Amino acid sequence: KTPKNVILLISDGAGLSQISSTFYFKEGTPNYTQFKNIGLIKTSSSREDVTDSASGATAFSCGIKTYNAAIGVADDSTAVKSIVEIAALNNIKTGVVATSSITHATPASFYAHALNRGLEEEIAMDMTESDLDFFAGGGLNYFTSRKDKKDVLAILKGNQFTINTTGLTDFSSIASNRKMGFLLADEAMPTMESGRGNFLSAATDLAIQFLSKDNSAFFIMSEGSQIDWGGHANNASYLISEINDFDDAIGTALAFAKKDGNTLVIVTSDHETGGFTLAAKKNKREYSDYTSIGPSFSTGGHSATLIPVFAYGPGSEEFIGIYENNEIFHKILKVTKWNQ
Amino acid sequence: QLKTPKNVILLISDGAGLSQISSTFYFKSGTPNYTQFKNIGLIKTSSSREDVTDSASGATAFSCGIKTYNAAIGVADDSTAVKSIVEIAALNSIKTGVVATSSITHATPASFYAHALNRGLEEEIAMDMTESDLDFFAGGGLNYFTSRSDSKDVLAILKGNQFTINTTGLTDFSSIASNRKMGFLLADEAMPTMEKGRGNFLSAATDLAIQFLSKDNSAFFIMSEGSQIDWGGHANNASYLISEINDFDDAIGTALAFAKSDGNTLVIVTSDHETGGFTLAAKSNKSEYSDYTEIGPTFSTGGHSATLIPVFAYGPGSEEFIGIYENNEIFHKILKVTKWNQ
Ligand SMILES: C[As](C)(=O)[O-]
Ligand SMILES: [Mg+2]
Ligand SMILES: [Mg+2]
Ligand SMILES: [Mg+2]
Ligand SMILES: [Mg+2]
Ligand SMILES: [Mg+2]
Ligand SMILES: [Mg+2]
Ligand SMILES: [Zn+2]
Ligand SMILES: [Zn+2]
Ligand SMILES: [Zn+2]
Ligand SMILES: [Zn+2]
């Protein structure tokens, strides 16, 4: 009932309908079918019925409701301790993986504290002050082509990071590093449609092997970042290709957890985007053909639907039922007994 | 090794996806009864021939435990009749009831007492009621029993089978307690909408079924349907959809209040499919920008969609309903937990 390790996978912008696309548009059975314990979260922020990713992720990373655009700060704008900082005090190794820039609102709410999510140069500099042990994502520009002219990589190397800006490597290439960071694009990683391939699964496997090196317990947040961008663009093949990749990472996590026996895997989203619907195909006589799906959208923004939570591993029963998003944080602390 | 329920209440919200359910968290006074549920599953709703299901195949999945074609009522993909949960209940000495806010002959209620090649055959469906072992029903659809193209009087046949029938109003329990079976036909076609003054019919009817079917310490099975959530969806009419699902949520609280007091009753809440691509979008301010402080509901289709659908279960055996499975497994899971003879 007490997990040693926690992997949190966040599919940005995926409601149940986006999840459902994997049951129609992906070869084979989705890894979602492996879960038995399922819950539901209410995703409103402290001030807005519709959340953004910043307050959405800060509800998970810090266990409070805060205003849209906040990174790691409470509604009154004061810094709050995150699960990464708490994990560091409990001797837990930590890693953050994302297919957006590593400074984007979701990863950022795990290692920075900023008044507004668009302060991405401040966020990059904030990593220099975090106990983060591993990261992988885009966003090389935020560390090396800055308004202030500073070389943030040099500071990170001073803090014991090895940084790779060229490719994800084998685990044998990084096993002896103390901390490891990958910055593999200037801004966001490529889309799956532009050849990103299995970055998310590979990077999440690297984080697991790296952070568990010396029998240390770990916490990892891996984010399927571009699902939401698909929803905002009302671009169905973009959305579906990104969520199928995210379902591959879920299989990666779960294959490790099932063998390990001491790992809790939580999958959820921050909010839904686009009103994405698996509607019947539309024909011109305009009528429906229920034999076939034609994905449609109703909005270019986020929506307030409750969002599914999936949990596998010791303590996974704590995540069933219907609760506010910020209680994800408290439920993790409860089952791991990591102290605050 | 789960607990075994004596009784089962299956509540269907037709047309309600997770976004429809979520509307009760923003548009209902107080806290939704959905929040009482701990055990939660997901069903895949495709029919035997269609990725996007209709109510008939999707309800027949629940009542008979098979995938079948859109429009089938209690019949298999080859059009042969299949034994239903209500027919199994009767053979196990279980009292049965069906409630709906549509006509009682409409596809969801029909799939639990009738066997017909096509949901359009509502006069045959009303006739099938006379050969079923149903003990209790309430809904609309008086026209299918007394104003038929074949000028037969079906009501007379139902009374011939030990039904008492009321076409006036729902009564209290002591009003109907001595009757061996009870039917309420309270509208010619569909019951009124919530916006046109239906009021608390669905909870009252469900409560009444529960008292009636549990006379003399009898085990029971009830299907009650929030039928018009779907029609709000089809019309792309937010206040209609939302008032109808708020009323369904009230029905959930009625079922759950009984189950908690009883302690021997499994309550299952699900839907057959989603409809309308209903979305709790950010309100538009005016030339148009999104204001995330508040919600303005939007739709993307006039028809059903293929999203996976949430299942909620509470009571003995409810742990059977977690995880992800085909819609037709609802039937098999009900059978498995109740330990009824098949
Ligand atoms: C516009 As349509 C045929 O999806 O209701
Ligand atoms: Mg994000
Ligand atoms: Mg800062
Ligand atoms: Mg495309
Ligand atoms: Mg119906
Ligand atoms: Mg028949
Ligand atoms: Mg209206
Ligand atoms: Zn987001
Ligand atoms: Zn977004
Ligand atoms: Zn339906
Ligand atoms: Zn419909």
XYZ file of C-alpha atoms and ligand atoms in Angstrom:
697
model
C 0.000 0.000 0.000
C 3.085 2.359 0.362
C 4.798 3.044 -3.000
C 8.529 3.829 -2.951
C 8.455 5.580 -6.383
C 5.908 7.784 -8.146
C 5.506 8.469 -11.865
C 3.010 11.181 -12.742
C 2.062 11.340 -16.522
C 0.071 14.450 -17.528
C -1.597 14.600 -20.903
C -2.104 18.316 -21.397
C -5.569 19.113 -22.646
C -6.924 15.539 -22.838
C -10.498 14.981 -21.642
C -12.169 11.522 -21.872
C -13.046 12.150 -25.522
C -9.339 12.650 -26.428
C -8.504 9.505 -24.342
C -11.285 7.648 -26.320
C -9.570 8.404 -29.690
C -6.874 5.830 -28.717
C -9.618 3.108 -28.716
C -10.441 3.977 -32.410
C -7.256 5.459 -33.967
C -4.360 3.490 -32.478
C -3.111 0.066 -33.563
C -3.646 -2.491 -30.767
C -5.204 -2.089 -27.330
C -4.523 1.296 -25.620
C -2.349 1.044 -22.445
C -5.231 2.880 -20.647
C -7.016 -0.525 -20.468
C -4.388 -1.694 -17.904
C -5.867 0.507 -15.162
C -8.572 -0.588 -12.764
C -8.582 2.314 -10.203
C -10.142 5.420 -11.824
C -11.199 8.730 -10.344
C -12.333 12.109 -11.557
C -11.035 15.631 -10.831
C -12.653 19.107 -10.886
C -10.128 21.409 -12.582
C -11.340 25.042 -11.845
C -8.689 27.454 -10.545
C -9.081 29.793 -7.462
C -10.655 32.534 -9.665
C -11.798 30.970 -13.001
C -14.240 28.187 -13.928
C -11.957 27.327 -16.841
C -8.388 26.669 -15.769
C -5.201 27.173 -17.802
C -2.205 24.830 -17.643
C -0.355 26.978 -15.109
C -2.910 26.856 -12.285
C -3.826 23.278 -13.422
C -0.339 21.948 -12.944
C 0.378 24.034 -9.815
C -2.737 22.355 -8.279
C -0.866 18.983 -8.831
C 2.682 20.115 -8.010
C 1.788 22.256 -4.898
C -1.727 21.054 -3.765
C -3.407 24.464 -3.822
C -5.967 26.226 -6.030
C -4.335 29.352 -7.602
C -5.057 31.928 -10.301
C -4.682 31.140 -14.054
C -1.056 31.892 -15.185
C 0.477 31.251 -11.703
C 3.555 28.960 -11.575
C 4.132 27.470 -8.123
C 2.598 30.343 -6.198
C -0.650 30.547 -4.145
C -3.640 32.716 -4.942
C -2.090 35.586 -2.917
C 1.033 35.134 -5.181
C 3.320 33.800 -2.407
C 5.633 30.785 -3.260
C 4.513 27.387 -1.994
C 6.639 24.225 -1.618
C 6.270 21.815 -4.544
C 6.347 17.969 -4.570
C 9.855 18.291 -6.082
C 11.144 20.301 -3.120
C 9.316 18.030 -0.666
C 10.795 14.979 -2.508
C 14.320 16.525 -2.102
C 13.848 16.906 1.703
C 12.818 13.149 1.841
C 15.856 12.093 -0.135
C 13.822 11.334 -3.226
C 15.437 11.790 -6.662
C 13.364 13.926 -9.143
C 12.943 14.320 -12.957
C 10.689 16.322 -15.339
C 10.148 15.363 -19.037
C 8.049 17.347 -21.517
C 7.549 17.527 -25.395
C 7.077 21.365 -25.106
C 9.901 23.678 -24.013
C 11.019 22.574 -20.487
C 10.018 26.133 -19.415
C 6.339 25.670 -20.543
C 3.691 25.994 -17.795
C 3.283 22.264 -16.913
C 6.947 21.282 -16.331
C 7.630 24.740 -14.957
C 5.137 24.385 -12.140
C 7.287 21.416 -10.906
C 10.602 23.266 -10.391
C 9.924 27.133 -10.556
C 7.949 29.752 -8.743
C 6.901 32.721 -10.879
C 4.071 35.187 -10.846
C 3.156 34.504 -14.457
C 3.806 31.600 -16.791
C 5.028 33.828 -19.632
C 8.151 34.764 -17.640
C 9.979 31.813 -19.255
C 13.538 33.298 -18.925
C 12.969 33.737 -15.200
C 11.663 30.085 -15.099
C 14.811 28.780 -16.823
C 16.927 30.677 -14.267
C 14.759 29.195 -11.501
C 16.017 25.727 -12.366
C 19.443 26.841 -11.130
C 17.813 27.072 -7.686
C 15.863 23.707 -7.772
C 16.994 20.250 -6.565
C 15.816 18.652 -9.850
C 18.061 15.727 -10.775
C 16.883 15.029 -14.363
C 15.044 16.850 -17.119
C 14.415 16.405 -20.840
C 12.530 18.680 -23.232
C 12.827 21.578 -25.622
C 13.574 25.207 -24.745
C 17.327 25.623 -25.379
C 16.645 29.278 -26.281
C 15.573 30.059 -22.716
C 18.954 28.991 -21.332
C 21.328 30.437 -23.949
C 19.696 33.147 -26.120
C 18.378 35.405 -23.343
C 17.600 39.178 -23.011
C 19.996 39.292 -20.055
C 22.807 37.621 -22.086
C 23.493 35.067 -19.298
C 24.653 31.548 -19.935
C 22.354 29.508 -17.701
C 23.894 26.242 -18.856
C 27.199 27.263 -17.192
C 25.379 27.798 -13.893
C 23.632 24.376 -14.261
C 27.041 22.720 -14.956
C 28.289 24.474 -11.777
C 25.361 22.672 -9.980
C 26.595 19.275 -11.189
C 24.479 18.959 -14.359
C 25.710 17.380 -17.504
C 23.749 18.939 -20.352
C 23.181 17.386 -23.747
C 21.838 19.526 -26.578
C 22.230 16.987 -29.349
C 20.178 13.753 -28.867
C 18.751 11.363 -26.268
C 21.522 8.923 -25.642
C 21.687 5.359 -24.292
C 21.565 5.014 -20.520
C 25.341 3.946 -20.584
C 26.144 7.492 -21.693
C 24.663 9.147 -18.607
C 24.776 6.521 -15.848
C 27.772 8.159 -14.198
C 26.455 11.786 -14.300
C 25.265 13.315 -10.993
C 22.417 15.255 -12.705
C 21.378 15.159 -16.358
C 19.530 17.592 -18.556
C 18.510 17.260 -22.203
C 17.620 20.390 -24.247
C 16.793 18.931 -27.603
C 15.183 21.795 -29.434
C 15.365 25.633 -29.358
C 11.641 25.973 -28.555
C 9.179 22.982 -28.483
C 10.194 19.433 -29.522
C 9.026 18.433 -33.054
C 5.415 17.121 -33.441
C 4.972 13.418 -33.901
C 3.910 14.251 -37.496
C 7.367 15.942 -38.004
C 9.341 12.947 -36.807
C 9.729 13.329 -33.019
C 9.349 9.486 -32.671
C 9.605 7.835 -29.323
C 11.198 10.697 -27.406
C 8.599 10.718 -24.589
C 8.829 6.925 -23.832
C 12.634 6.860 -24.263
C 13.150 9.941 -22.034
C 10.828 8.548 -19.389
C 12.688 5.204 -19.430
C 16.024 7.178 -19.096
C 14.696 9.156 -16.155
C 13.656 5.893 -14.418
C 16.983 4.197 -14.914
C 18.955 7.332 -14.014
C 17.010 8.354 -10.920
C 16.947 4.853 -9.511
C 20.735 4.369 -10.060
C 21.796 3.756 -6.472
C 18.566 2.215 -5.106
C 17.206 5.732 -4.517
C 13.422 6.326 -4.512
C 12.190 8.746 -7.266
C 9.400 11.032 -8.435
C 9.005 11.758 -12.205
C 6.532 13.987 -13.997
C 6.314 13.279 -17.789
C 4.086 15.387 -19.888
C 2.378 14.706 -23.269
C 2.486 18.523 -23.916
C 1.286 18.875 -27.488
C -2.057 17.133 -27.136
C -3.457 20.513 -26.020
C -1.891 22.273 -29.028
C -3.777 19.890 -31.291
C -7.002 20.815 -29.462
C -6.344 24.613 -29.757
C -5.672 24.226 -33.487
C -8.837 22.074 -33.910
C -6.372 19.733 -35.783
C -7.538 16.096 -35.284
C -4.633 14.210 -36.753
C -2.247 16.386 -34.718
C -4.190 15.792 -31.532
C -4.623 11.997 -32.124
C -0.951 11.365 -33.077
C 0.187 13.180 -29.906
C -2.239 11.344 -27.595
C -1.270 7.893 -29.115
C 2.439 8.745 -28.330
C 1.388 9.674 -24.737
C -0.373 6.243 -24.505
C 2.946 4.631 -25.534
C 4.647 6.410 -22.554
C 1.874 5.093 -20.255
C 2.880 1.546 -21.400
C 6.538 2.374 -20.688
C 5.686 3.508 -17.152
C 3.386 0.600 -16.494
C 5.784 -2.059 -17.802
C 8.435 -0.717 -15.389
C 5.942 -0.410 -12.471
C 4.496 -3.964 -12.901
C 7.961 -5.516 -12.804
C 9.177 -3.162 -10.000
C 6.165 -3.787 -7.728
C 6.970 -0.656 -5.640
C 5.896 2.065 -8.078
C 2.731 4.111 -8.207
C 1.730 5.466 -11.699
C -0.803 8.234 -11.884
C -2.117 9.429 -15.297
C -4.281 12.506 -15.643
C -4.718 15.768 -17.485
C -4.850 19.378 -16.439
C -8.139 20.197 -18.320
C -9.769 19.419 -21.701
C -9.191 21.444 -24.885
C -11.262 22.105 -28.046
C -14.532 20.267 -27.164
C -12.993 17.402 -29.233
C -15.843 14.912 -30.054
C -15.802 11.472 -31.753
C -18.887 12.570 -33.841
C -20.337 10.448 -36.725
C -18.777 11.087 -40.109
C -20.606 13.894 -41.958
C -21.854 13.420 -45.559
C -23.468 15.844 -48.044
C -27.001 14.845 -49.324
C -25.342 17.132 -44.680
C -26.314 13.951 -42.654
C -24.543 11.506 -40.256
C -23.084 8.084 -40.996
C -22.783 6.280 -37.632
C -20.714 3.535 -39.156
C -17.660 5.845 -39.079
C -16.084 8.590 -36.846
C -15.381 12.176 -38.060
C -13.656 14.111 -35.162
C -15.060 17.625 -34.574
C -14.414 20.540 -32.184
C -16.490 23.308 -30.811
C -13.961 25.683 -29.311
C -10.391 26.884 -29.695
C -9.923 27.107 -25.900
C -10.003 24.947 -22.697
C -13.125 23.487 -21.153
C -14.284 22.771 -17.593
C -15.162 19.126 -17.868
C -14.173 16.864 -14.983
C -11.028 14.943 -16.048
C -10.266 11.182 -15.532
C -7.471 10.112 -13.207
C -5.929 6.586 -13.640
C -3.806 4.952 -10.914
C -1.855 1.697 -10.801
C 0.494 0.444 -8.045
C 0.680 0.643 -4.194
C -1.821 3.201 -2.914
C -3.725 3.487 -6.308
C -7.083 3.016 -4.436
C -6.536 6.509 -2.817
C -7.206 8.092 -6.256
C -10.811 6.826 -6.956
C -13.898 8.884 -6.456
C -14.495 12.560 -7.349
C -12.211 15.277 -5.866
C -10.709 18.689 -6.671
C -7.434 18.647 -8.844
C -5.274 19.976 -6.022
C -5.996 16.905 -3.971
C -3.733 14.951 -6.325
C -0.761 16.511 -4.409
C -2.204 15.583 -1.013
C -3.042 12.014 -2.103
C 0.530 11.424 -3.326
C 2.002 12.694 0.010
C -0.487 10.506 1.871
C 0.337 7.182 0.154
C 4.175 7.747 -0.146
C 4.355 9.141 3.476
C 6.840 11.667 2.104
C 6.850 14.278 4.924
C 6.243 18.037 4.585
C -14.277 -12.148 -2.724
C -16.918 -9.369 -3.093
C -20.259 -8.918 -1.291
C -23.385 -10.114 -3.121
C -26.245 -7.602 -3.614
C -29.827 -8.773 -3.101
C -31.158 -5.857 -5.189
C -29.971 -3.851 -8.229
C -30.950 -0.372 -9.489
C -29.527 0.538 -12.972
C -29.962 4.278 -13.754
C -29.322 5.322 -17.347
C -28.701 8.940 -18.419
C -29.283 8.699 -22.145
C -26.893 10.871 -24.170
C -24.772 11.883 -21.124
C -20.997 11.944 -21.536
C -18.583 13.113 -18.900
C -19.023 16.786 -20.046
C -22.845 16.461 -19.450
C -22.257 14.903 -16.030
C -19.767 17.695 -15.246
C -22.420 20.379 -15.890
C -24.078 19.411 -12.526
C -20.873 20.616 -10.835
C -21.407 24.154 -12.216
C -25.126 24.502 -12.906
C -26.882 22.735 -10.037
C -27.470 24.281 -6.585
C -25.544 22.298 -3.848
C -23.318 19.215 -4.399
C -24.063 16.570 -7.143
C -25.005 13.115 -5.952
C -22.344 11.853 -8.374
C -19.801 12.770 -5.656
C -21.054 9.863 -3.447
C -19.411 7.347 -5.824
C -16.008 5.883 -5.210
C -15.987 2.988 -7.691
C -15.797 4.252 -11.283
C -15.351 2.463 -14.647
C -15.378 3.229 -18.379
C -17.377 1.601 -21.148
C -16.752 1.454 -24.848
C -20.076 1.919 -26.599
C -19.731 0.835 -30.319
C -22.450 -1.515 -31.705
C -21.811 -4.752 -33.680
C -21.917 -2.705 -36.973
C -21.310 0.950 -36.035
C -18.579 2.902 -34.301
C -21.249 5.371 -33.149
C -24.059 3.563 -31.313
C -27.800 4.431 -31.004
C -29.918 3.981 -27.844
C -31.344 0.621 -28.948
C -28.097 -1.261 -29.513
C -26.482 0.513 -26.580
C -29.387 -0.385 -24.201
C -29.641 -3.936 -25.500
C -25.856 -4.263 -24.669
C -26.885 -3.597 -21.005
C -30.107 -5.558 -20.919
C -28.925 -8.646 -22.881
C -25.130 -8.567 -22.764
C -24.456 -8.673 -26.533
C -23.240 -6.286 -29.233
C -25.920 -5.818 -31.814
C -26.874 -3.561 -34.717
C -28.180 0.029 -34.288
C -31.939 0.015 -33.930
C -32.101 -3.621 -32.537
C -34.331 -4.036 -29.453
C -33.444 -7.126 -27.339
C -32.237 -9.021 -30.421
C -28.852 -10.300 -31.549
C -26.956 -9.216 -34.666
C -28.878 -11.920 -36.694
C -32.228 -10.512 -35.386
C -32.928 -13.444 -33.062
C -34.299 -12.726 -29.586
C -31.859 -13.014 -26.720
C -32.667 -13.585 -23.034
C -32.612 -10.338 -21.041
C -31.665 -9.439 -17.490
C -35.413 -8.891 -16.709
C -36.212 -12.442 -18.035
C -33.329 -13.821 -15.830
C -34.633 -11.722 -12.851
C -38.158 -13.278 -13.233
C -36.752 -16.812 -13.293
C -34.865 -16.104 -10.084
C -38.042 -14.889 -8.287
C -36.865 -11.222 -8.680
C -39.453 -8.416 -8.927
C -38.738 -6.042 -11.905
C -39.545 -2.398 -12.817
C -38.786 0.167 -15.540
C -39.129 4.015 -15.369
C -38.475 6.515 -18.119
C -39.207 10.184 -18.908
C -39.808 9.257 -22.555
C -42.598 7.024 -23.842
C -42.274 3.603 -22.176
C -41.947 2.101 -25.720
C -38.868 4.299 -26.497
C -35.635 2.418 -27.225
C -33.957 2.360 -23.750
C -36.966 1.148 -21.640
C -38.016 -1.129 -24.591
C -34.710 -3.018 -24.563
C -35.444 -4.304 -21.086
C -38.890 -5.968 -21.684
C -39.306 -6.317 -25.519
C -37.669 -8.083 -28.541
C -38.204 -6.316 -31.818
C -36.193 -6.058 -35.090
C -36.365 -2.273 -35.044
C -36.877 0.398 -32.436
C -39.469 2.055 -34.848
C -41.878 -0.845 -34.103
C -43.336 0.870 -30.993
C -46.807 -0.730 -31.345
C -45.119 -4.211 -31.346
C -43.054 -3.097 -28.361
C -46.171 -2.091 -26.387
C -47.663 -5.540 -27.269
C -44.425 -7.249 -25.992
C -45.077 -5.637 -22.616
C -48.065 -8.030 -22.358
C -45.808 -11.093 -22.688
C -43.048 -9.820 -20.285
C -42.696 -10.563 -16.588
C -42.296 -6.856 -15.631
C -44.029 -6.067 -12.334
C -43.878 -2.308 -12.401
C -43.516 0.497 -14.968
C -43.919 4.279 -15.246
C -43.476 6.674 -18.183
C -45.273 8.159 -21.177
C -46.564 6.489 -24.328
C -50.337 6.076 -23.773
C -50.810 6.448 -27.604
C -48.995 3.080 -28.190
C -51.483 1.240 -26.020
C -54.821 2.966 -26.937
C -54.440 4.988 -30.173
C -52.839 2.266 -32.361
C -52.813 1.931 -36.203
C -54.120 -1.570 -35.612
C -56.966 -0.245 -33.343
C -56.198 -3.002 -30.771
C -56.705 -2.256 -27.062
C -53.438 -3.223 -25.413
C -54.339 -1.794 -22.093
C -57.096 -4.412 -21.848
C -54.517 -7.155 -22.458
C -52.203 -5.697 -19.764
C -55.018 -5.645 -17.207
C -55.741 -9.255 -18.287
C -52.192 -10.035 -17.108
C -52.673 -8.677 -13.565
C -51.627 -5.066 -14.269
C -53.377 -2.207 -12.569
C -52.990 0.816 -14.802
C -53.142 4.534 -13.867
C -53.177 7.237 -16.616
C -53.956 10.073 -14.182
C -50.947 10.839 -11.880
C -48.323 9.015 -9.817
C -49.788 7.941 -6.482
C -48.176 7.295 -3.041
C -47.281 3.698 -2.123
C -50.290 2.816 0.136
C -52.451 3.706 -2.973
C -50.999 0.780 -4.971
C -49.681 -1.598 -2.316
C -52.273 -4.414 -2.799
C -51.928 -4.455 -6.617
C -49.988 -7.384 -8.019
C -48.402 -5.265 -10.830
C -48.593 -1.571 -11.491
C -48.293 0.500 -14.608
C -48.331 4.353 -14.911
C -48.918 5.832 -18.372
C -48.821 9.548 -17.704
C -48.532 11.136 -21.090
C -49.581 10.313 -24.613
C -45.939 10.309 -25.908
C -43.011 11.702 -23.845
C -43.479 13.075 -20.307
C -43.208 16.880 -20.126
C -39.629 18.385 -20.068
C -38.304 19.790 -16.751
C -38.738 23.352 -18.257
C -42.467 22.523 -18.906
C -43.242 21.496 -15.397
C -42.483 17.766 -15.128
C -41.048 18.296 -11.616
C -39.940 15.363 -9.551
C -41.480 12.530 -11.549
C -38.296 10.529 -12.065
C -37.190 10.390 -8.358
C -40.828 9.888 -7.157
C -41.397 7.056 -9.681
C -38.077 5.392 -8.763
C -38.907 5.654 -5.049
C -42.360 4.213 -5.724
C -40.918 1.242 -7.724
C -38.501 0.529 -4.920
C -41.360 0.322 -2.268
C -43.610 -1.656 -4.623
C -41.000 -4.136 -5.829
C -39.718 -4.809 -2.252
C -43.122 -5.859 -0.762
C -42.990 -9.125 1.179
C -39.191 -8.994 1.507
C -38.754 -9.541 -2.257
C -35.471 -8.945 -4.072
C -35.804 -6.477 -7.006
C -34.163 -5.066 -10.178
C -35.037 -1.542 -11.508
C -33.888 0.331 -14.610
C -34.782 4.042 -14.446
C -33.910 6.281 -17.356
C -33.213 10.041 -17.590
C -34.469 9.885 -21.176
C -34.468 13.494 -22.322
C -30.863 14.426 -21.518
C -30.293 13.034 -25.082
C -32.948 15.187 -26.647
C -31.391 18.386 -25.125
C -28.111 17.155 -26.741
C -29.761 16.570 -30.171
C -31.332 19.991 -30.096
C -28.027 21.679 -29.080
C -30.137 23.230 -26.297
C -28.030 23.790 -23.124
C -30.688 24.734 -20.576
C -32.796 21.693 -21.671
C -29.870 19.244 -21.391
C -28.775 20.749 -18.106
C -32.209 20.828 -16.410
C -32.726 17.172 -17.484
C -29.420 15.906 -16.081
C -29.927 17.900 -12.844
C -33.178 15.975 -12.484
C -31.374 12.674 -13.191
C -28.850 13.553 -10.457
C -31.798 13.960 -8.039
C -32.841 10.395 -9.050
C -29.324 9.177 -8.288
C -29.645 10.695 -4.709
C -32.989 8.821 -4.273
C -31.419 5.492 -5.296
C -28.318 6.046 -3.153
C -30.391 7.171 -0.084
C -32.246 3.800 -0.308
C -29.059 1.772 -0.934
C -27.302 3.343 2.067
C -30.259 2.706 4.433
C -30.809 -0.809 2.907
C -27.178 -2.010 2.718
C -28.061 -4.848 0.357
C -28.527 -2.870 -2.911
C -26.093 -2.218 -5.808
C -26.680 1.024 -7.597
C -25.117 1.421 -11.116
C -25.202 4.780 -12.989
C -24.152 4.931 -16.626
C -25.141 6.171 -20.061
C -25.605 4.516 -23.392
C -23.496 7.079 -25.403
C -22.733 10.815 -25.453
C -24.688 13.247 -27.589
C -24.066 16.664 -29.162
C -20.333 17.057 -28.365
C -21.497 19.158 -25.347
C -18.534 21.178 -23.946
C -18.203 23.452 -20.891
C -16.306 26.120 -23.029
C -15.220 29.492 -21.696
C -17.956 32.099 -22.085
C -17.651 34.442 -25.102
C -17.438 38.184 -24.427
C -17.977 40.765 -27.109
C -15.384 41.241 -31.510
C -15.273 37.921 -29.524
C -12.818 36.832 -26.813
C -12.993 33.872 -24.356
C -13.498 34.755 -20.716
C -12.274 31.793 -18.579
C -13.942 33.084 -15.440
C -17.323 31.619 -16.503
C -18.717 28.837 -18.794
C -20.720 29.119 -21.998
C -21.772 25.575 -23.144
C -21.176 24.736 -26.839
C -21.939 21.745 -29.110
C -20.213 20.402 -32.214
C -22.792 17.939 -33.600
C -26.518 17.191 -33.767
C -25.873 13.430 -33.287
C -24.291 10.877 -30.953
C -20.576 10.448 -30.363
C -18.260 7.465 -29.705
C -16.467 8.674 -26.500
C -15.960 6.130 -23.701
C -18.658 6.604 -21.031
C -18.272 6.710 -17.236
C -19.899 4.022 -15.098
C -20.523 4.684 -11.376
C -21.267 1.878 -8.856
C -22.066 1.893 -5.114
C -23.083 -0.971 -2.844
C -22.254 -4.737 -2.600
C -20.304 -5.940 -5.668
C -19.648 -2.405 -7.010
C -15.859 -3.120 -7.258
C -16.770 -5.389 -10.271
C -17.524 -2.271 -12.371
C -14.153 -0.470 -12.240
C -11.628 -0.497 -15.091
C -12.344 -0.299 -18.833
C -14.619 -2.657 -20.693
C -17.138 -3.131 -23.505
C -20.751 -1.773 -22.755
C -22.192 -5.291 -23.080
C -20.118 -6.447 -20.053
C -22.461 -4.382 -17.820
C -24.963 -7.226 -18.284
C -22.380 -9.926 -17.501
C -21.051 -8.051 -14.457
C -24.700 -7.635 -13.048
C -25.217 -11.404 -13.561
C -21.866 -12.242 -11.985
C -22.257 -10.165 -8.774
C -25.968 -11.067 -8.094
C -25.140 -14.818 -8.636
C -28.534 -15.252 -10.380
C -29.051 -18.474 -12.376
C -28.560 -17.592 -16.066
C -23.910 18.858 -38.461
As -24.152 16.987 -37.859
C -24.887 15.915 -39.328
O -22.715 16.320 -37.096
O -25.466 17.030 -36.707
Mg 1.426 21.768 -20.744
Mg 11.180 32.779 -9.621
Mg -4.210 17.168 -39.481
Mg -33.461 6.543 -24.080
Mg -41.629 -8.838 -30.131
Mg -32.597 26.531 -23.696
Zn -3.034 22.661 -20.294
Zn -4.106 25.073 -23.800
Zn -29.337 7.119 -26.399
Zn -30.055 10.275 -29.411
